[PDB]
Amino acid sequence: AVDTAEQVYISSLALLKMLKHGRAGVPMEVMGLMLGEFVDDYTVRVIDVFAMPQSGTGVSVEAVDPVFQAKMLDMLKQTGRPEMVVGWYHSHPGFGCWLSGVDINTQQSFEALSERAVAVVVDPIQSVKGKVVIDAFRLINANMMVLGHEPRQTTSNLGHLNKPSIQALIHGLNRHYYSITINYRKNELEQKMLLNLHKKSWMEGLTLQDYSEHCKHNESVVKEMLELAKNYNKAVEEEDKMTPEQLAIKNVGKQDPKRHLEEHVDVLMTSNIVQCLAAMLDTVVFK
């Protein structure tokens, strides 16, 4: 049996292949393989990911010829080092994460050879910048659903941590499959070299900024900042009046001075203090 503390380790490398292939053909359900490395009865490690040419419909998506599959795995053994197929994924476009009535069927084909084929859903729409909603699954027997017997024999305080969505609960969870808690394998091998490689620049700051127009832009804000302060020479004057909780609901048609009047003060500061300081270092450094 299982302990519902399965703890699927994935990677740092596979998920970018997951989302790029998932989003380049997003409204169709694209899918692929999961090529990883098995460990003990509890955990599993999926390290590499590749897709195949597919043929789809609106509600269904299929594969094509199996000669693509064996020839791809031969070339990945000879280059790098050999692995084994730990599972498979697919991509609900903007749905969420569940096993539909056809998604459950090819899972049933894959769980026969190895019983631990991990079924993975990636949604490349719901993922904005943070949560990437993924939620890997695996089947449970509908024979034990007939028995009324509750499976998986909880022996660790690790499973019931993330709560399922109600929309995935409308679907087959939890009558034919279960969820798995996952995290990410992170290391200085990779974590240091995506941070210190992505957002970097070279001259954007040792340079000046359109020197006749920066001082011109120092009037393009201040000119309407007069009349915006005239509204601030207006709105305080109608206080000691109708209970300023009313002055929250009422003022939603037009812009207030008070919040907008500290908005430009930050802008009229950092545009000046940066441009003044960066000019006064080139006097020292350059002769």
Binding site: A1, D3, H149, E150, P151, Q153, T154, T155
Partner: protein
């Protein structure tokens, strides 16, 4: 005597069985508290949750009437509760030399040999529970059995 003084004060055994003498005389518990929680029979954590309850409220009192009321509800959950069911046997017998090997004579790993080795592998876990800070044969009776054993299913308890 003053020659016998180093055994009376540094082994400190007369603080052990006198504490056992305190618990065998003073024991004010209830059976109904487990029987109030009896009605949660399902496939959930509850089997492990009741056997971790009666072990904490009967530490070192050797009173196995809360556990011997049945067999099947205790032996319903498997594969780690039976690691813990033989683990909870030593806490009830905490701090007593005699009733460690003799009550677990069913639960030596080479006597019955069932399909569950966690039932017999977690016995040496409970042998450490009784003789904590008490090292004699209990060091070496657990030292020699780990020289040759099964995988890390008895070696956890060992």
């Amino acid at each position: 005597d003053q020659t016998l003084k180093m055994i009376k004060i540094l082994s400190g055994e007369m603080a052990i069985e006198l504490h056992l003498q305190f618990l065998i005389r003073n024991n004010n518990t209830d059976l109904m508290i487990l029987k109030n929680t009896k009605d949660a029979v399902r496939n959930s954590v509850c089997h492990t949750a009741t056997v971790i309850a009666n072990s904490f409220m009967h530490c070192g009192t050797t009173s196995d009437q809360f556990l011997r009321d049945n067999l099947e509800w205790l032996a319903r959950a498997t594969n780690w509760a039976k690691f813990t069911a033989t683990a909870s046997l030593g806490v009830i017998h905490k701090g007593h030399e005699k009733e460690a090997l003799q009550l677990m004579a069913t639960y030596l790993p080479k006597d019955t040999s069932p399909g569950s080795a966690y039932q017999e592998g977690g016995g040496l876990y409970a042998l450490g529970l009784i003789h904590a800070n008490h090292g004699g044969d209990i060091i070496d009776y657990l030292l020699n059995q780990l020289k040759n054993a099964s995988n890390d299913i008895v070696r956890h308890g060992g």
